[PDB]
Design a protein around this nucleic acid. Structure first.
Ligand SMILES: COc1cc([C@@H]2c3cc4c(cc3[C@@H](O[C@@H]3O[C@@H]5CO[C@@H](C)O[C@H]5[C@H](O)[C@H]3O)[C@H]3COC(=O)[C@H]23)OCO4)cc(OC)c1O
Ligand SMILES: COc1cc([C@@H]2c3cc4c(cc3[C@@H](O[C@@H]3O[C@@H]5CO[C@@H](C)O[C@H]5[C@H](O)[C@H]3O)[C@H]3COC(=O)[C@H]23)OCO4)cc(OC)c1O
Lengths: 760, 760
DNA sequence: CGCGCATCGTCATCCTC
DNA sequence: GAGGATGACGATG
DNA sequence: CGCGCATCGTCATCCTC
DNA sequence: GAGGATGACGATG
């Protein structure tokens, strides 16, 4: 009785023989954990140790079809390794002895990712074998997350709140050399030996008491308890907000040694952190509409200038190095590719430039090449969207004592209304279609005036399809068809979410031949597709055309598309989630949040210009004094020079003062009055400085004269000019994409008016 | 008759039916070529087009065992796709019609890599079916390498000599916008349409006339014609040297349209370039002993400072970006890993620092983690090995109008004698064992004195094994065994090339049990292996120990290792290959090449110090003149100031003069006399400058007084101090690697003296 | 260096007793 | 006792 | 994101009629 | 003619 199916399994010495109850099956996530286990178990033993590497997410068997259960080979092989039988109750001790193993130990990192794997495993086990949750069948192995060392003294920490309490309870901080442990590649064999030297500290079992815990086990895995999970997340968010406001430290686990672990606290304390993290990283906020990955990428791009092009794979490492990215490399490259996509039906305004094959509009749009095959370059719109002067507005986080990206940004327009926010998280989701960019400026101007803004319509770049709204939060999108002759027909325009391969396989194949129930509808079809436009030389029987007209062209060819927008939940500026009703309310909230910052920017600009103004004034006064002549330069000591500078009414460095009043808002400094070359002593330099000192005075007087209003329009004027330039470049690209072919012929076309089923 | 084995094959419409002679099978290297073909053939057609992607190198069937032929599944599937039969002659037209295809078109890039694939394919076909080389069975598809564009005017170029002739024949260079085409990811569908628009230009067939060409076909594929290939490479190298000396341009192919292609020119012109490139990139030179990949990595590392650590995957992109690396990413990361390995038996002096798991000495040393899992940091020895002042000695290449790495370097010691040169190329190879680093300094000192240097012995870091040389260019290496008791035995030291897993599987398993012919030799064994040391608690019958002693301990346990060093072929400073005889001759040649550069460095340093010396002298004179006072600073025009500076004997910028005399070796410049701040007018600055101007004079007088000799020893003194510091750090690491265990017990040990078989 | 299984939740079709 | 067969190998496809 | 086949040539074992 | 079943989906394992 031995396993020979997969070679990756570490067959134990007693796996299949005597002492089946003492056989231990270890599940290791990822693949580096397998190497760590092979390197570490060489000292402890090999008899009661069978290691199996894990791939990743586990298929949820609680809600799946019978065909779906037999799909993943690995899940099926788990039974072959263990020996489970669905139609047999494992209640008697002999039934437990029958199994090839007696205990299952799973090990994960201190991150929240392992919580999902543990929950999926508990679901897979309890869904068919609840009675096995009381016979010491499951246990857990843990790892450290951070270690401090000073003078050969090490301390173990397994929780971030534990580390925070250690910092709050110990004096002389920044003395213990700190070392983070984000992944498995950091640990070595010498550390694994110490890890396996103490089993009572890491090898911790579980405990089950009362059926009520099973309800919690079902809480995160029931499709009928969505509102219950919503209330659960709401209670947790309220508790966290109250604790942060009161400043009381939260609770954590693994403070001292533990033998068992209750399921109720296990669900209420560990998996909830993964749920909160997934929700924070999945859906963007309403202020800037940017996800944390896009935020890190854009911040790293802002860090440099990037005048020339740059590789994607090379940029991903630079982003991960400074943004503290700890989610592999594939996800970041995928996010960069999604930011790079700008074809029709995907986005309306990108932050990069299309260089290479970023996926066409024919086959899924995901047929792009390797990130190193393709190149990229920053766009010119980002400079106007995020002005650099806004760097002094938001407060950055402090991780690793490093200046990192902020929590959000302040754009000139809501990005959710221009690129769409499609986020799927726990408790809620977000799906907002695109709109027109030209109407946004008119709406903002009308709102600045104080009039009721007109209702908007979902628009797309390079899309001539009309959209009519019958019921609120519901939209119908149809394409355009051209009838050249009573026999020939051509589809002019396709609606959103229409891929060439999918539409072909789902429409042309059933219509071409006679299916099991439908006669062959079409007689001929051709696909002269260009890079962006489509062509359909399709022939049809004239008699069948009348029936198609009576039924409906959009109905027969399936050109109609219905969408509903109800999940208007976004992260507020504070951090809460509120289900919204209309777009205009979101625009008004953004307008108020933006109005709050005109005074802040004005206060930051006011006085800052005055600082350099006074500095130049003092420099000019020093030059005039030198022209008159009182300060002897004949090897005078610096002490007398500083004394004269103080006695003659010369202030210190204003830039130093503004820098000092930034963290929380010897003696005098006069380096700037002595770091000036002799070129200042020339006539031309003095003449140009005499007006350079007034060039700043003009702007200072204008700022003292101008109001906080009338600035948004002046800022938008340059943006509209740049947008017209970008549209001219797009028209030039269309001229480049012009082969020299003839224009589309005019033909009869109609749009069907679907009866309103009064849905919702 | 259809193919259903692999889904990757693009089944043609006529593949298996009528018109078998007209069926065309296309072989595409890599995987991007398959996407390019799918994107391009959509316009031309799909009936007579069957595309198959290629994996890479092809197994050589001309010299392989019968078992080896049936190993690669892809090679076997090639027959299933085509329909070849080994025991059937395809001479009659009906036999050609029987095959599923009539023509084979292969396409590769303009690089030399495709030449190897084409040669392997020609070998695979001709080895069993020569008669098929005369019936239009094979053809070729080509791609561009570079394109120029200006004012909507494009020109195609397929050869680097063609591009050189175009540059030499056309005026107004740097006007046509150039675009390189190194790989397949650069080309787009719009370019593929133009590529397939002209078949007569790219689709070129072949021609065979006379059996003599077959000899050339065998020349690059015969294991008995090694000397013939050596003469062939020698003739080509001599011809290239003569053509470069005479300045005559070489010959190239694809100048005009061609219908056929002779095999003789095909072998003598295209594959020879791949052979030369592989030979240039495989074996390092004798001057620095660094391969081009190591050279690019080290140059990129020199470009930056790298005070902190850095990732390997992140560094690889930065190396590829500046060094013009066009060989993927895996090879560069593998080269970095090889540079990072410093364990016993691999290297003696690395250029990096071990951070992470770089592979242990237990399982092949190739069990390291992902390049992003591990970190790296530059060592401190590189600063002394390659002084920055040597940057003005060698002339860098000019690729893409960019300053790139040089062709070689000038180290203080020959790297081949400290890290080994193991290169395998066409025509020759190189395998040089390691030696002792301490003896190199003594040998160099003795050579500088003028005495005959003592013979050296191959040494290794942390290796106590003795080596005795009986015959020249031959070495015997043995380990050490400890006999604790008449029954117990332990192996103290293992010889070079001894891996724990391999030695165990090849020695302990046959000795433990009774094999088909040998009784069980050992009775027990234990493996208490540490990170570096080994332990063997092995028991043996006392009676069998006497027989083992009579036969030989090194002989029975296979502890002896024999190696011969005969391939002493290295690239000379000129570029030629000369088979060397002894190491001392190599040391003398390196000593002469190094002596040639003392005068060059002295000439570069002489005058350069004088330039800043005169500059500081002029600055001090200007300060003294200002103390006396003649130059009025009252808004005087710059023209009068320049006139006074000229009339008072003040020279221009010497740094500008040295910069001008570097490429081939308004009016005056006085910016440095006016770019000085007022701090120079202070007493302390003047007092410190009065001695700073003489600090350079002291070194200048010392250089004028010192000789070109006595500099190498002074340079080596700091290097020996740093080497002692590095060895102290290694001893500190050994103290870190000290668990606290007891020392190895003293025991009887012996080294066998093998009889000399007088080999070679 | 291309190959491949899933998660959270929301919704458009869609088909049969 | 000697010649064909088996792997060691290091950059690249 | 780990999985896997080869090339150029040189040489150490190595084993059987 | 209505309710359970099937995929669309976007960041990560
Ligand atoms: C191999 O070893 C491990 C794999 C993984 C998974 C994974 C799992 C897979 C799988 C593929 C992958 C792969 O992701 C895939 O990338 C693809 C690239 O973008 C587009 C094309 O499509 C993506 C797939 O949607 C995604 O699934 C890995 C990337 O990083 C991960 O986290 C992924 O196909 C089969 O099951 C986790 C591990 O432990 C931490 C492992 O040890
Ligand atoms: C998948 O598609 C393609 C693959 C290739 C080969 C390749 C071929 C392989 C194969 C693996 C590989 C892989 O290299 C492997 O890296 C490994 C990593 O370092 C150590 C561990 O061991 C190396 C292998 O020795 C090497 O073989 C590719 C890396 O870049 C290449 O050039 C390699 O295993 C099976 O056959 C070329 C192509 O066309 C351009 C392709 O389209």
């Amino acid at each position: 009785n031995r396993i020979k199916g997969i070679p990756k399994l570490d067959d134990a010495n007693d796996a299949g023989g005597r002492n089946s109850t003492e056989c231990t099956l270890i599940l290791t996530e990822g693949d580096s954990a397998k190497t760590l286990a092979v390197s570490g178990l060489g000292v402890v033993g090999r008899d009661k140790y069978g290691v199996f590497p894990l791939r990743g997410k586990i298929l949820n068997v609680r809600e799946a079809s019978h065909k779906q259960i037999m799909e993943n080979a690995e899940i099926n092989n788990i039974i072959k390794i263990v020996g489970l039988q669905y139609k047999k109750n494992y209640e008697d001790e002999d039934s437990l002895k029958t199994l090839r193993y007696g205990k299952i130990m799973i090990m994960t990192d201190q991150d929240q990712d392992g919580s999902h794997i543990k929950g999926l495993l508990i679901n897979f086990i309890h869904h068919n074998w609840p009675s096995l949750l009381r016979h010491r069948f499951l246990e857990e192995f843990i790892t450290p997350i951070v270690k401090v060392s000073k003078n050969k003294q090490e301390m173990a920490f397994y929780s971030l709140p534990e580390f925070e309490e250690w910092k709050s309870s110990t004096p002389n901080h920044k003395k213990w050399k700190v070392k983070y442990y984000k992944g498995l590649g950091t640990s070595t064999s010498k550390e694994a030996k110490e890890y396996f030297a103490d089993m009572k500290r890491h090898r911790i079992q579980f405990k089950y008491s009362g059926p009520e815990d099973d309800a919690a086990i079902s809480l995160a895995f029931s499709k009928k308890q969505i509102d219950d999970r919503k209330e659960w997340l709401t209670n947790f968010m309220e508790d966290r907000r109250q604790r942060k406001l009161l400043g009381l430290p939260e609770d954590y686990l693994y403070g001292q040694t533990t033998t068992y672990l209750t399921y109720n606290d296990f669900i209420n304390k560990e998996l909830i952190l993964f749920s909160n993290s997934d929700n924070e990283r999945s859906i963007p906020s309403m202020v800037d509409g940017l996800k944390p990955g896009q935020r890190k990428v854009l911040f790293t791009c802002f860090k440099r200038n990037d005048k020339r092009e740059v590789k994607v794979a090379q940029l991903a490492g630079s982003v991960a190095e400074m943004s503290s990215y700890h989610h592999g490399e594939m996800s970041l490259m995928m996010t960069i590719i999604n930011l790079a996509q700008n074809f029709v039906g995907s986005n309306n305004l990108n932050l990069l430039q299309p260089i290479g094959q970023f996926g066409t509009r024919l086959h899924g749009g995901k047929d792009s090449a390797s990130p190193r095959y393709i190149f990229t370059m920053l766009s010119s719109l980002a400079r106007l969207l995020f002005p650099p002067k806004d760097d002094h507005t938001l407060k950055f986080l402090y991780d690793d004592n490093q200046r990192v990206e902020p929590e959000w940004y302040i754009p000139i327009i809501p990005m959710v209304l221009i690129n769409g926010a499609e986020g799927i998280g726990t408790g809620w989701s977000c799906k907002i279609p695109n709109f027109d960019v030209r109407e946004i400026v008119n709406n903002i101007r009308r709102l600045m005036d104080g009039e009721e803004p007109l209702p908007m319509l979902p628009s797309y770049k390079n899309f001539k399809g009309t959209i009519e709204e019958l019921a609120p939060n519901q939209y119908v999108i149809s394409g355009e068809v051209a009838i050249l002759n009573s026999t020939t027909i051509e589809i002019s325009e396709l609606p959103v979410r229409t891929w060439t391969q999918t539409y072909k396989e789902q429409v042309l194949e059933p219509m071409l031949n006679g299916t099991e129930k439908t006669p062959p509808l079409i007689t001929d079809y051709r696909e002269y597709h260009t890079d962006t436009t489509v062509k359909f030389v399709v022939k049809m029987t004239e008699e069948k055309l009348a029936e198609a007209e009576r039924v409906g062209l959009h109905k027969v060819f399936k050109l109609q598309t219905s969408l509903t927008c109800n999940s208007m939940v976004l992260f507020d500026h504070v951090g809460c989630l509120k289900k919204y009703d209309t777009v205009l309310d979101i625009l008004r909230d953004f307008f108020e949040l933006r109005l709050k910052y005109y005074g802040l920017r004005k206060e930051w600009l006011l006085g800052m210009l005055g600082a350099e103004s006074a500095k130049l004034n003092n420099q000019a006064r020093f030059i005039l004094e030198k022209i008159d002549g009182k300060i002897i330069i004949e090897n005078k000591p610096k002490k007398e020079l500083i004394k004269v500078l103080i006695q003659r009414g010369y202030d210190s460095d204003p830039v130093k003062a503004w820098k000092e009043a930034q963290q929380k808002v010897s003696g005098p400094t006069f380096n700037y009055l002595l770091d000036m070359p002799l070129w200042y002593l020339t006539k031309e330099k003095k003449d140009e400085l005499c007006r350079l000192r007034n060039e700043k005075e003009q702007e200072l007087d204008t700022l003292k004269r101008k109001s906080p209003s009338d600035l948004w329009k002046e800022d938008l004027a340059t943006f509209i000019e740049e947008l017209e330039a970008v549209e001219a470049k797009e028209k030039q690209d269309e001229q480049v994409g012009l082969p020299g072919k003839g224009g589309k012929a005019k033909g009869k076309k109609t749009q069907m008016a679907e009866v309103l089923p009064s849905p919702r």
